[model samples]
Structures are given as structure tokens and as C-alpha cells.
Target chain A: DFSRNLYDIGEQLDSEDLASLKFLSLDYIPQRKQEPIKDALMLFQRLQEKRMLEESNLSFLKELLFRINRLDLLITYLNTRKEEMERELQTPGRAQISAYRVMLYQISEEVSRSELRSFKALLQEEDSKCKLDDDMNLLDIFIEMEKRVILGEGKLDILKRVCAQINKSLLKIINDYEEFSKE
Target chain B: DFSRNLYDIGEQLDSEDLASLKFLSLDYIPQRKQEPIKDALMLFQRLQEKRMLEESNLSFLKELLFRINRLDLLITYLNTRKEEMERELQTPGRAQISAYRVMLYQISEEVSRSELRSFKALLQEEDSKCKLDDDMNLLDIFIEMEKRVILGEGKLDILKRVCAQINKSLLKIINDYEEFSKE
Candidate 1:
């Protein structure tokens, strides 16, 4: 009975995993609010405050752990498995985590430190609406681009062009995502 | 009673470390000759064959371990400390591992997989005397470039250009090496 609580689930997650969970929840939560959260418990509380998470609706949390490849957490806490989530996500409009967010996450994973620096350099050449900063990470860059309509659900032309310039090989992932949406 | 042998060093190195050793030995030992050996012992044998490694002349081996940041291996086998090697390398022409080779190694470390792919794609745009295979790695590409007089001791213009195009941030290491040589 004690282990089934959200606190236990939050406690079981590592610090890095908590960060991933918060990142995955960015679609449902604001960046400014998520930035100060230091633990999974607080992140869960924030998600619940927006009604994005509930005792009966653990789909978003399940999607997060699944996206981060922490299937053990899903089994231990939610009594759910990957195949269950996989099948559910296959249903129309069933995925709690957006494909667009996943695409950006995949792009971030494939980006190298050198490429990130190049990206920052390239951003300087564009007088876009983004409030570019020296400390912003790749995720923050994506979000800023989204806010300016430079990137969105099906509007990834700027992102694809940026990836092509910074790291041409990263275009493969972007192309894969582009093709995925059509099917 | 049965230590201080090169075979022990070779045997103790992990597979990846062995690869690094073989890569570091490229300037002293040809690439084609070093490729067939399956283990560190064979790498040592090949190095010894070329008079690059011997019990009395273990400076090259010590430098290899040091270059790879494996100081523990130096203490375990050669009874050499980082400070001892550091002071020795500070002397003119005393360092067995060339600073140029170290630069290439550093560049390889900083390069991302996407950048590597982009590099290969860029190589196709140029026609040189070198024969590049589909399976060649970054080190092999450097060696082949060296053979064609495109990259060597202080002739890193082509490499610097390639790196600049592949990942502009990598220029920091190249520039640092360039400044060090001028000093």
C-alpha cells in the first residue's frame, strides 16, 4: 500500500530521470515554472495542478517514463508496461506526449557539443523574434523557436534548415519525423 | 616478480583503449600493418618490430597511456607518474607522441557522429590521390590524409579547413595547437 503512492514513484526516480520527466512535461507545463522544480514530487504536483496528471489519469506520467526508456518505473509504480503504452499511443489522439516534442528531444540527443556551439553562432546571424541568450540550452532554443512560430506541429522548416546548417547528418532524424507525419 | 612487461600492459588495456593505442602508434607504425593485430599484445609486438617499444625504451608506451588519460596504467606497469612524463614531455623533442597527433586525437574526441557523417559527405566533394573506403574511421581518414601530404606535423591546413566546415567549434583545438607551435 505504501509503495503505490506517487511519492514512492517520485523517490524511485534518479535526479537525471526527474529532469527528463520535467522536460517531457514541458508541453503541458510552462518552462519558467518547470525550471525551479528540484524533484519529481514537485514536478508531479505541478502537473496535477494543471490537471494534466491525476490518480486515475497517469497516462502523461506513464508516457514520460516510457519516453525516457525507464520501463522499470512504469512497471513498479504504475503497474503498466511498455507494450500497453505503445498500443495506447497508437490509438488516435491517445498519446499524452506530442510527436513534435519527441522530435525535438531526438534532435537534442543527436546534437554534439560542438554542433550546439555552432547552432548558437548561427542563431546570431538571424534577427528573429527569439530572445536569444548565451545560457539557453538546445531545449530552450526549441521552445523559443516555437514561441516565434519558427517551429511547431507541422511547421519545422526553420528547424530543418537549422539542423542542416549546424549538423547535416541530423537531417536524417528530421526527415524521418517529416515522413512519419504523412503516414 | 613477473611484471614490467609490455604484454601485461597490452593485456590489461580494454578493447577501446587498445584501439586508442594502435591509433596513437600510427605515425610510428603504418596503419595497414597495425590493422591486423587483434589485441594489445600484438600491438606491442608490432611496435617492438618497428623499434618503437622496448623494455629499455618504454617512453613511447608511457606517452601513449598518458595521451589516452590512463595514468593508472602507467603506474601499474611502467612505474611512471603523470608529473614525471609531464616534465619530460616539456623538454624539446623528448615527447614521443607528437603534439600534432594529440591535436588530431582531440579533434576526433570533440567530433560528433553527425559531424563525422557530414565529414564523410564533404570528402566526396573533393578529388584527391587518397583512397577512402566506406568503413574507414576518423583516425584512418587522418592517416590517409597524412599519406597524401594533406595533413602532417605542421601541415594541418586541409584538416583545419575540413574541421571548420564539419564543426566550427572544433577550430578551438586546432587554433590552440597552431598557437602552441608558433610559441
Candidate 2:
């Protein structure tokens, strides 16, 4: 019965939200583990195995919901408000989501589809096509970049370029992460 | 006396010139071999050892000199003009300067000191400092970027970010490179 609860929870999360959720889980979940996961439901199946998707401890799930702008789901399913998440995540070491993922999330959140088209065009020039498709969202594009070995935890050059092509100010996320890593 | 003539050629070209010369040489010379070289004269000595520095066979030398814009020395020492070097380089396979190095050389050439200022600042934020100093030229900065693993033969995303920060147009050099590599 409890197992099916995560299934219902998984239904609320669209495939578009999965990449950001998966990216946030990277520090906790190894790449290999996350690789074979076919979709949102399968990923929750993986997360539930660790007692991470339980009713008692849904902070990670709530954080993911909040990160992908699914605050409505946070309220509707998890019964957690956005303000609660904002305050709770601010507590030292309480947030499950890494700052690196947040920057990428914010990049996806703010970037327009037209700008994304530019990014996709640029990726084609880099010959990072085929893994890419019309269905791939920005987060999926990021995952592909990681697999291509062009982007990494400390490597934001490609990310910075993508941001530069779209919005110059978003480059702050890149510089800020570089500054954050030093300390 | 003839060997000393190379030393004179080296003396005329600065250390900044050596790096562009060496970057252009990377397609020909290996990195480990170039690592211990201290100055312009030492680089010329290395070239002489490879028979790369000779009056009769100065194609590589002329290309290196020409690429660095040391036209005065090209005429004074070799009696060759820029137009002559340009014409020779246009011939198929006659140019020794790799297209990759030309992009990097052009980035170094066109990037202004004030623009370079932000690049150093950004590098410092990336925590790749100390080895970098005020005296280090743009070419030197590029060498450091390569050694640090942010920039490479086929990887210019980091360089793209720097260009994006100062000049938007140089971003083409990065994209063009990605295009060139495929075919």
C-alpha cells in the first residue's frame, strides 16, 4: 500500500521535472544508478528503496518538488507549503539539493524556448547530437553535456557559454558557483 | 655562427612570441618536450635540434614568426615579407600554423588588456592563480587555461565564456572550431 503511494506521487511529476530531480540527487545517487532509470516512476522506485520516498521523510522529495517549480504539488500531495520549504531548506545543511543543481535548475527555469533552440543549435555544432532530440528538455541537454565530458562539477565553461548566448546576467550563476567552490 | 643566428632570432622575439610559436608547434611538438623550456632562446634551441630552425628550411620558422606578427624580424632576418608569407601559407598544406592555434592566437591577439583583466579575475575565481601574474601575457593565459584543463584543442567553451564576457563576436571562433573538428 505504501509502495503504491510513491507510484501516485510519481504520477504527479512530469518527465520534464525528472532531470532536475535526478540532477539534485547526483550527490547522493551515483551516475550509474541514475543512468538506467527509464522515467519518473522508475526513479521513484529507486528512491523508495532507500526509504527516501517515505511519508515520514519527504524532505528530499519536497525539495525536488520545490526546485522544479512544482510548489503546487508540494502543497497538493506533500501538504508542504512553499514558504515552509524556503525556510526549512535555508537551515544549515538541511537542504538535500546541491547548489550546483540549483544553478542549473535556475538556468532552465529562466531560459526561454527560443534561447534553448540556440543552445541546441550550438550543441549540434559541437556534434553532440543523436543523444539530443526534440523531446529533450534543458535539463536533459545538461545531462547529455555531462555524458559528452564537456561539463562537470567544477567545469562550467560550456554552461557559461550557453548562458552567455542567452542572457549575460545568468552568467552570475556560473561565476557564483566557481566562487562557492573555493570556500 | 649560424647557430648563433637562431639565438639572435630568438632574442628579437619576446617570451609572448614563444608561447604562440609553441602553441602553433603543439601539432608538431609534444607538450612534455615543451614543458621545461624557460625562454624564447631555449625554444629556438629546441627547434634547432629538430632542424626546424634553419635558413634554407624556415617554413615552420617563418610561419611561427608570421603568426606572431613579427613582420619586422621576418624582413630583417629572412628578407621575407608578410605578403610573401601570406601567399605561401595560402597554398595547400604549406602553412604550419594549425587552424586550432590560429583561433587561440586570434583570441590572444584581439583580446584587449581591460578585457584580459576580467579573464584573469575569472581565472582567480576559478582558483587557478599564483602561477598567473601581471607579466603573463594573453598567450600565457591561454597556456595556463590549457594546463588547467578548462581549454583544449577541441574544447574552447571556457575560452568562449571569456570572449562572451568582453566581446560577443569572438564566440564564433569557438563554434567554428566545433564545426571544423567534425569534417
Candidate 3:
């Protein structure tokens, strides 16, 4: 949520949309109920929140910090999650988790790539935003993130194509579980 | 809405980020009188809520079955409202409308793509979640929806980029408006 807010704010400033609601409203949203199944839901929410916060922070730095090694790290970390979700989860409903990861990672890559490209072009065209003090690193990081996003997307694509097979695998597992429970 | 809900639920079975508090407690959100401002806040709420729904089967098919192209076009049209503020009203203090539109569009596209990719793979690769397999269009529609999402996001990218430039131009104009107001 914080990362998204930063992206919106950056875009608003970039586009000069003076009417943007403050990013503070994001933090103001109410806490949801995970009750009835409180323990599991709360644990899940906490774990997810931690990941989102980390990713969001990484996304912001991708633009403001503009470090190649850092961007590479971001891409690698994000891609690892995607790769695992695709390869490990061969079940009926697990695609959502994998999809969510890929989608978020993809957007981060897309937006960051845009910034990196624009910043570089600006340096050559008008030299306004900032000097490309580390052009090689910039290019390397940009390309790497681009690849990771593509790989993540492709891995997701395979997951989609192979989902049916996974469902069969999962259904059998469920059937076995039910049978075992009855015994 | 149903398909989206299905997919969301499916996603949520494993990933807890999909479970948001706003879904169960929307009434608690404080709404402001200003339409655009309130809309932006609500949009954020909706994003999280939808994330929770991602695990549901409803989230998948509804999002797929629905007409994404129309939605994308409408979103683009709605976004142009900011241009009206720019060109006609000469209003400068509240151009945040465009940013809101852009953000919503970006999110919508991202969600659609992720959902469709996951849905298709589930149906095509796995042979388990074939609730209505005869309706092959269901899966095809999912694929198409993903494409539309990618295209829509691309369209939004152009808008976001151009919107940034417009902001600079608008800011200068707004300054002029302020100068006139003072005069």
C-alpha cells in the first residue's frame, strides 16, 4: 500500500496533479477482521503486510535511490518468490498467490523501468532530472529487472497453462485426505 | 464481480494479503464531501478489498466474464475529466482527479492481467477446476481479458507520462490564475 501511494504521488507530482489526496490516508484505513478464523487470518495478514512493506520500500528506492545493485537485489528477491510459487504450488487454487506476486512484481518492474529510462533520456535530452552518474549500473539494473518481470510473467503463463493438471493432482490429494479422515 | 471474486477467493486460500479489513467494515471509513477526494480514498479501499476477494471463484470468472474493454475505455474517458478542469474551468487546485484515474486504471490493469493468466492456466493445464468446461469461451475470455489489461495498462502509461508533463504546464497556468486572483 505504501509503495502504491508513493507511485501515485510521484506520478501526480510528475504530472503536476495538484489535487492528489495525501499518502497519509493509506495508513488511515481501518483494520479488517480475521475473526472466527482469527488466528490464521491475523498471522497471514501480518506476514503479508511485512512482505508488502518490504516490497513497497524497495519500489520507492528503485526511483529515489536509483542504485543498480539495489534494483538487482529487488528483482532477484521478487523473482525468487514468483519462481517458487510457479514451481512449488501445483494445486487448484494456489495460482492466486502466485499471480498476485507476479502482478505486483511486474508493476514494480514496469514503473521502475519507466523511471530509469526516462531519467536516462532526460540526462541526454535536457539534463534536467539528474546526471546519470552510474549509467552502466542503471542500464544493467534496468535490463535485469525487465528480464525478471518477463520471466515472472512467463512462469505465471506456464502456471496458467498447467493449472488443470495441477487441479487433478490437488483433487486427488483432497480425496485422499477425506478418505484418511474418515478412517 | 463474481469472476473476480472467485479468483480472489482462490488466491486467498493461501495468500492472506487478499484478506482486507475494508471488505467487512466499509461503513467505518470516513468519507469526505469532495467527490474526487472521496473517490480516491475509496479506490484504495476497494483495491485492498478486492485483494481479499482474489481467492474466491467468483473473482476469477466475473472479472473474466465481464467486458474489460468497455471498462478500460470508460476509465480512460473518466480520467479525461481532469483535462476538463485544465482546459475549460481553468481550475488548477484540484487536478488530482487525473492522478486518481491513472492510479485506478493501473491497478485495474494489473489485477485483470494477473487474474486472467492464473485462470487460464488453471483451466488449461490442470483438469480440476473445470466447473463449466463446455463454456470454453470462459477460458478464452480470460486470455483476452489479460491482453486487454496489458493494453489498458499501456494506455494508462501514456496517460500517466503525459499527465506528468501536463502537471508542469498546469502548475505554471495555476500560478497565473493565482496571480490574477491576487490582482
The best-first sequence of candidates by lDDT reads: 1, 2, 3
Once fitted onto the true fold, the runs of candidate 1 whose alpha carbons sit more than 4 angstroms away are A1-52, A60-79, A82-183, B1-16, B48-58, B71-85, B154-157, B164-183
What's the CA error at residue B121 for candidate 2, in Å? 19
Ten-residue region with minimum lDDT total, candidate 1 chain A: A160-169
Separate clash counts for every candidate: 0, 0, 46
TM-scores of all candidate predictions against the true structure: 0.51, 0.47, 0.17
Task: After superposing candidate 3 on the true structure, give the runs of residues whose Cα lies further than 4 Å from its correct spot.
Answer: A1-183, B1-92, B96-102, B109-183
lDDT of 3 at A120: 46
- What ranges in model 2 sit over 4 Å off? A1-4, A35-41, A124-132, B1-183
Best by lDDT: 1
True contacts kept of each: 0.00, 0.00, 0.00
How do the residues B1-183 of candidate 2 rate in per-residue lDDT, one tens digit apiece? 666767777776665667777777887677888878877778777887888776577778778887876755676567776678889887977876678888887877667666778878876766554368887887778777777877777677667766777776577776776686675
Give per-residue CA lDDT, model 1, range B1-183, as digits (tens). 223476677666777677777888777777788769898888877877888777677778788887876654676567776679889888989977777778888887676656777776666565367778777778778777877877787686777767778777788898888898986
lDDT by residue (A119-139, candidate 2, tens digit) is: 787567555543778777787
Which model is ahead, 1 or 2, in terms of TM-score?
1
